[PDB]
Scaffold this active site. Structure first.
Site, short mmCIF file in Angstrom:
data_model
loop_
_atom_site.label_atom_id
_atom_site.label_comp_id
_atom_site.label_asym_id
_atom_site.label_seq_id
_atom_site.Cartn_x
_atom_site.Cartn_y
_atom_site.Cartn_z
N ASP A 34 -2.13 80.57 22.60
CA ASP A 34 -3.57 80.79 22.75
C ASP A 34 -4.06 80.47 24.17
OD1 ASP A 34 -6.29 81.21 22.25
OD2 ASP A 34 -6.57 79.23 21.37
N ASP A 219 -7.69 86.35 26.80
CA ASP A 219 -7.48 85.55 25.61
C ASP A 219 -6.42 86.13 24.67
OD1 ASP A 219 -7.62 83.68 23.63
OD2 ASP A 219 -9.66 84.19 22.97
C1 LIG Z 1 -10.94 83.23 20.01
N1 LIG Z 1 -10.48 81.87 19.73
C2 LIG Z 1 -11.10 81.11 18.82
O1 LIG Z 1 -11.94 81.56 18.06
C3 LIG Z 1 -10.74 79.65 18.72
C4 LIG Z 1 -9.23 79.52 18.85
C5 LIG Z 1 -8.88 78.08 19.20
C6 LIG Z 1 -8.61 79.85 17.49
C7 LIG Z 1 -7.09 79.88 17.53
C8 LIG Z 1 -7.87 81.18 17.53
C9 LIG Z 1 -7.95 81.79 16.18
C10 LIG Z 1 -8.53 83.04 16.03
C11 LIG Z 1 -8.61 83.61 14.76
C12 LIG Z 1 -8.11 82.93 13.66
C13 LIG Z 1 -7.53 81.68 13.82
C14 LIG Z 1 -7.45 81.10 15.08
N2 LIG Z 1 -8.74 80.43 19.87
C15 LIG Z 1 -9.42 81.37 20.37
N3 LIG Z 1 -9.03 81.91 21.52
#
Ligand SMILES: CN1C(=O)C[C@@](C)([C@@H]2C[C@H]2c2ccccc2)N=C1N
Length: 361
Positions: A34, A219
């Site tokens: 991430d 991202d």
């Molecule tokens: C877009 N985004 C999030 O909403 C928060 C987090 C930490 C989370 C890990 C991303 C995620 C997106 C969808 C479902 C579960 C996790 N990471 C991101 N870059």
């Protein structure tokens, strides 16, 4: 870096994960890659939807930090307990690091029922790490404690998906043509600056600040190419206009509905984002195909109140280099991107004046 090639796995829409080990003796966990966050956080409790979890009681090298953290999101949410432990990446640098770990002890609509990952590897900067920037993110620990170079690169290749996280370098076999670099504006998210947007070659003629309002980030943790409302507005109509051969329900362009056709592309425009280059008044463009923004189909371009998010719709077309040492991000045509006639492209140089004005303050 043959050992690190193809070290990423996942499912369509559920993100890319890398295998990691935590604790002594090592406990294997699948961890989301991430670039959109900065915490290393793993599930540490038997949530029914997880295949496995960090068991601190089994680790001789675990150290409690006696501090809890709460992290809300646009939908999901988690809270945990901070500590440190020995961490490794089996298909990565033959190296072991003491990193901070957020042991997730409760969550809501965060983990994905069906996913094969049980933790998050936030690859962004301390500035947005939670609780605050005192909590050293994993990669910063990796660089301080070893001789692993301060950069990593990602090729996301896209029912199983696959990819590569080259930690500490660049594998030249994962891209064709040349890498073009865009400056990382500020070290928090991987923030970049878009200076021009073309649909099928036709400028949207919007103020370039709108492209990056309030920000533009890279991202890996996001699926879509998310654009700010006004940009997204102009984007869709241009894309719709360019796609007048066949018609579609308004609701669908908003992702509020799906669409489907028959087995066995050209009626759809390519999309180019011009990025700030390394030199004053020079830029370059990255171009994607409908094979990137039409996901097997669903329209993979959404609107946003948090700015532009260059998610997997962008990343699956390119080899992306996170050159932290030189505060810049490199784009190159990916050797694994799906195409037609047409092909994802990274081209330059171009002359673009006042690029710094495109940033929001
Ligand atoms: C877009 N985004 C999030 O909403 C928060 C987090 C930490 C989370 C890990 C991303 C995620 C997106 C969808 C479902 C579960 C996790 N990471 C991101 N870059």
């Amino acid at each position: 870096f043959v050992e690190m090639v193809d070290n990423l796995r996942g499912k369509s829409g559920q993100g890319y994960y890398v295998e990691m080990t935590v604790g002594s003796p090592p406990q294997t966990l699948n961890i989301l890659v991430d670039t959109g966050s900065s915490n290393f956080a793993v599930g540490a409790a038997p949530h029914p939807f997880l295949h496995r979890y960090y068991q601190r009681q089994l680790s001789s090298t675990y150290r409690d930090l006696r501090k809890g953290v709460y992290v809300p999101y646009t939908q999901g949410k988690w809270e945990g307990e901070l500590g440190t432990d020995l961490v490794s990446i089996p298909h990565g640098p033959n190296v072991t690091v003491r990193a901070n770990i957020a042991a997730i002890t409760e969550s809501d609509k965060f983990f994905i029922n069906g996913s094969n990952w049980e933790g998050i590897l936030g690859l962004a900067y301390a500035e947005i790490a939670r609780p605050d920037d005192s909590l050293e993110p994993f990669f910063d620990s990796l660089v301080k404690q070893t001789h692993v170079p301060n950069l990593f690169s990602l090729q996301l290749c896209g029912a199983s998906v696959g990819g590569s996280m080259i930690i500490g370098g660049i594998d030249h076999s994962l891209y064709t043509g040349s890498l073009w670099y865009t400056p990382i504006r500020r070290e928090w998210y991987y923030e970049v600056i878009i200076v021009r947007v073309e649909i099928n070659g036709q400028d949207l003629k919007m103020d370039c600040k709108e492209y990056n309002y309030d920000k533009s980030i890279v991202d890996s943790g996001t699926t879509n190419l998310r654009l700010p409302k006004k940009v997204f507005e102009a984007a869709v109509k241009s894309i719709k206009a360019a796609s007048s051969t066949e018609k579609f329900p308004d609701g669908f362009w908003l992702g509020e509905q799906l669409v489907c056709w028959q087995a066995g592309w050209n009626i759809f425009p390519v999309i180019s984002l011009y990025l700030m280059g390394e030199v004053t008044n020079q830029s370059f463009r990255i171009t994607i195909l409908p094979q990137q923004y039409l996901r097997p189909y669903k329209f993979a371009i959404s609107q946003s109140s948090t700015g532009t998010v260059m998610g997997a719709v962008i990343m699956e077309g390119f080899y992306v280099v996170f050159d932290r040492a030189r505060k810049r991000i490199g784009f190159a045509v990916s050797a694994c991107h799906v195409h037609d006639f047409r092909t994802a492209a990274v081209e330059g140089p171009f002359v673009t004046l006042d690029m710094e004005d495109c940033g929001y303050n």
